[PDB]
Design a protein around this nucleic acid. Structure first.
Lengths: 17, 201, 64, 143, 117
RNA sequence: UAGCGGCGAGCGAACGGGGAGCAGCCCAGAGCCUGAAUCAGUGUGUGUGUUAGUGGAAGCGUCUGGAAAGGCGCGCGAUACAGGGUGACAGCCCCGUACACAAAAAUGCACAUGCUGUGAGCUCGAUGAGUAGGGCGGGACACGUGGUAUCCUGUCUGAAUAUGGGGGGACCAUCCUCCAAGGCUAAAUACUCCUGACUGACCGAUAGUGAACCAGUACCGUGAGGGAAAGGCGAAAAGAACCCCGGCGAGGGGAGUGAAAAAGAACCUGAAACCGUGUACGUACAAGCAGUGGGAGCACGCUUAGGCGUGUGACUGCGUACCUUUUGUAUAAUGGGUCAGCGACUUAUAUUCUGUAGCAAGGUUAACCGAAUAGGGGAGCCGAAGGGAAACCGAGUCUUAACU
């Protein structure tokens, strides 16, 4: 039971406070 | 010192240094332990993470995955492949000085005489290669676990005691500390005794 | 394998009777005109290795 | 009796085992402290490293040279001088006694005392007191 | 010489869980939580072996103070009178006497009052 | 160790000694004598081994038990108690084991005897040229161009030939040693895809080969390639005839088999997390690491008739998890959903110190030999003498013209 995840995620506006 | 007989009642002269010296507990134990270690063969081995069948591909990417960082399927903390420190075939025999071996043997022989576990007799032989004859010869002497040491090895005595587990037949040259300690009684022939001092010196 | 002596160390330290080490002083190579004769004279004889760095010397040359 | 032999007291120590519980003493890094180069697996500095400062074996100047003649010379004691062979001693027949070695071709006799039997030495060198010692014993010197 | 630690490990876990019997939820079922609960109970038991002595001391003083005041004297005055009268009865007996034997306590306060005066 | 080395990190000989094993020849050519030894290939004969195998000793009665090989009592074999199986643990029930034998046919090995082919012995002569060496550029020798010998080579040159030439660590002279530019040669040495036997302080199904189960399979990838999980009924299937509920089901209750069916094939043992039914006690006006100290009541049992134990626990004092990392964490800093299993200071060779044992101005062998953990083997290593860069000197030595 491994099920590798190949899901990239969108780059949100970085905090850069 | 003087070694008495139980059959011929004949006096025997033997150096007291090799038969009447004190019993060195520490020295004898080291020789016995060394003898047991030399009996090993150390034929064993496991596979390290390099010798385990597999591939070096990383199971998953370093980052992004929600699980622990992994480098190979063969890591020791992984199922089916590992062994952090795999054993290799090694020699367990250890060095024992010649004098230390002789000293332990002299110490062992003296104490056997002190505990009357050593019996000196005349020539010990069997007319025919029959285990039944040897059993009878040892039965009337009230001996069941004995180590027969003879100056000259004869096939007739060797074959008679082959099927007797509790009985062993040996030559003076082929004498080891473990056999003397292990066996309840030791029977030495007159010839066998003489060669012992010569080799022990 | 047997330990390898540090060859550079073996060319600068010599072992003595009581286990010490003698070495040449380290300020008598060049730029000698401006030095007083007293300081050059005192640097000529060999000197013993200090206690603090003795342990370092032992590791460098375990055989010699 | 094979199950009665025991070793001398203090012959065994059982060794040190690292990282086996709290009560065992040296657990949780097993006596190598907290973070640092020395705490890492396989970490440490090579011999003579001083943290970047010029090592002692580099601050000092190399001196002297090796003499090949020194490896083919040996010193003979007075104690072992008389146990070579009868009462004659020379460059040869010392190798038979095995006190110099096959390769040695120069030898000297120094004052080590305990010389009784008068002996003759040919081809060797007796420093100052070896000459006196043998002469008292009854030896002689000739080249 | 491979060594399997199944038997020993199960013995240790059983021992801890047995000591955690009666705790609520995972504290009596799960070893990881039970071990913390058992250790904490050990700390509290050590601490409360000392608080018990002072807690009972406070209770005895309160009982004596109530009994002494009922007889017409403050606790501090009553104890001072006993010390002056050379009476070595401690608080535990004094509280016990006050609860059960009223006459004996009345004699004690009377003795304390005489010593003070 | 000597040396090499941004003289850094590191690399690291030889001479010489002790062992295993030993074997020396042929062509560059003519003559005399010509199977003359030794070799290779094909026949015959002896011995041995491999490929099928044969014989192979000796126990019974009672007790427990489903069943004994176990307990008890009395016997026998053993040149055979090495192993395996058999209803629990077998020297004497079975297969084997020590031991003694066996081959029509095919084969490897060591010999003797035939054939074929090159080929003995003596005299004289000859005795390897684009080579040695050199210039330039590289590489190999521990040796990185350094004072660098020696070897190999891409490029350009280029001898003497035995009254000659090479080497002996720049180089020269003298001495010593050898004869390149043509070849052949078993032994001691390295390894195991495979075959047989034997052994193991090696593993025992998350271990051991990835694979104990028809596994490199299923499965994933266009492809090279990657790559699992999954063992256990019982001594023997004797694997549940038959009856009943049910959908001519599934599943179940009887019956029967068996020592045992909560051994029924979803089958040895059957833990924990997790999920339930029953019983006792507590809980719907009471605030928080859920415990701890005190503690009434209730329900069960014990002797005594008072308590002791077991379970629960109203009420009450105190009390903000663990680990890690930190000057400092309940911290709202890190890590963990839980359980079970696995998971991290090891091993080899050297060096120093401590303890202990042997021997002692001596101690100890390595390889190897060895019917062998013995005994041989003392090659060698460490120590008893140091000083100096070294020659050298020596209980002294160095420093200095020499020491108060």
């Amino acid at each position: 039971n491994n099920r590798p995840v190949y899901i990239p995620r969108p780059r949100p506006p970085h905090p850069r406070l | 010192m003087e070694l008495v007989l139980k059959d011929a009642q004949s006096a025997l002269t033997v150096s007291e240094t090799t038969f009447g010296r004190d019993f060195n507990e520490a020295l004898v134990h080291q020789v016995v332990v060394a003898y047991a270690a030399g009996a090993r063969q150390g034929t064993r081995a496991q596979k390290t993470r390099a010798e385990v069948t597999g591939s070096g591909k990383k199971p998953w990417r370093q980052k992004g995955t929600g699980r622990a960082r992994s480098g190979s399927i063969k890591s020791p903390i992984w199922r089916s492949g590992g062994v952090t420190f795999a054993a290799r075939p090694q020699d367990h025999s250890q060095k024992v000085n010649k004098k230390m071996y002789r000293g332990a043997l002299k110490s062992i022989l003296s104490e056997l005489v002190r505990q009357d576990r050593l019996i000196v007799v005349e020539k010990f032989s069997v007319e025919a290669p029959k285990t039944k004859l040897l059993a009878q010869k040892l039965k009337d002497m009230a001996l069941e676990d004995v180590l027969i040491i003879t100056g000259e090895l004869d096939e007739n005595l060797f074959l008679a005691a082959r099927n007797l587990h509790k009985v062993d037949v040996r030559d003076a040259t082929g004498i080891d500390p473990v056999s003397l300690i292990a066996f309840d009684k030791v029977v030495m022939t007159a010839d066998a005794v003489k060669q012992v001092e010569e080799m022990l010196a | 394998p047997k330990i390898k002596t540090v060859r550079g160390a073996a060319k600068r330290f010599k072992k003595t009777g009581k286990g010490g080490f003698k070495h040449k002083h380290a300020n008598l190579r060049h730029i000698l005109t401006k030095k007083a004769t007293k300081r050059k004279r005192h640097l000529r004889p060999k000197a013993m290795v200090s206690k603090g760095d003795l342990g370092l010397v032992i590791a460098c040359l375990p055989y010699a | 009796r094979l199950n009665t032999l025991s070793p001398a007291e203090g012959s065994k120590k059982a060794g040190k085992r690292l990282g086996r519980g709290i009560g065992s003493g040296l657990g949780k890094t097993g006596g190598r402290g907290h973070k640092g180069q020395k705490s890492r697996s396989g970490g440490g500095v090579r011999r003579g490293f001083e943290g970047g400062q010029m090592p002692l074996y580099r601050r000092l100047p190399k001196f002297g040279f090796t003499s090949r003649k020194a490896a083919i010379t040996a010193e003979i004691r007075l104690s072992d001088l008389a146990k070579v062979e009868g009462g004659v001693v020379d460059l040869n027949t010392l190798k038979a006694a095995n006190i110099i070695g096959i390769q040695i071709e120069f030898a000297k006799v120094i004052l080590a005392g305990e010389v009784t039997t008068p002996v003759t030495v040919r081809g060797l060198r007796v420093t100052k007191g070896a000459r006196a010692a043998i002469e008292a014993a009854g030896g002689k010197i000739e080249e | 010489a491979r060594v399997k630690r199944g038997v020993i490990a199960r013995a240790r876990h059983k021992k801890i869980l047995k000591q955690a019997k009666g705790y609520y939820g995972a504290r009596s079922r799960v070893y990881r939580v039970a071990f913390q609960a058992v250790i904490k109970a050990g700390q509290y038991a050590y601490r409360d072996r000392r608080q018990r002595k002072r807690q009972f001391r406070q209770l005895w003083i309160a009982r004596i103070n109530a009994a002494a005041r009922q007889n017409g004297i403050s606790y501090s005055k009553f104890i001072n009178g006993l010390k002056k009268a050379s009476v070595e009865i401690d608080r535990k007996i004094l509280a016990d006497i006050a609860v059960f034997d009223k006459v004996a306590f009345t004699a004690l306060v009377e003795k304390a009052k005489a010593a003070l005066a």
